[PDB]
């Protein structure tokens, strides 16, 4: 793989779990954590940085240009794929 991740880290599951999920409207942040602790629950350390550190991945991917968040956090999160403007 292309630039591999060392490991499925946040960014990574966040990131993969989005598509793994159904259409709808996207994917709730609320949903994405369901499904993400749910079923990566042998493999997602779960200790004590998920909660904090799950949405801090998520700030991630919004800048990553893949990730959208219309009305942010209050927001049911979606896939985009069109970068934003670069500013000169």
């Known amino acids: 793989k292309a630039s591999s991740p060392s ?3 946040y960014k990574e599951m966040i990131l993969k ?17 369901k499904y993400v602790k749910d079923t990566f629950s042998s493999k997602l350390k779960t200790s004590s940085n998920f909660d904090y550190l799950f ?28 970068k934003v403007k670069l500013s000169t």
Request: charged letters at 25%; glycine letters at 10%; one cysteine or more.
């Open 17 to 33: 779990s989005m598509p793994q999920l159904n259409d709808g409207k996207g994917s709730s942040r609320i949903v994405l954590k």
């Open 7 to 9: 490991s499925l880290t």
């Open 55 to 82: 949405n801090s991945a998520i700030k991630k991917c919004v800048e990553n240009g893949e990730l959208v968040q219309p009305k942010g956090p209050s927001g049911i999160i979606k896939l985009n794929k069109k």
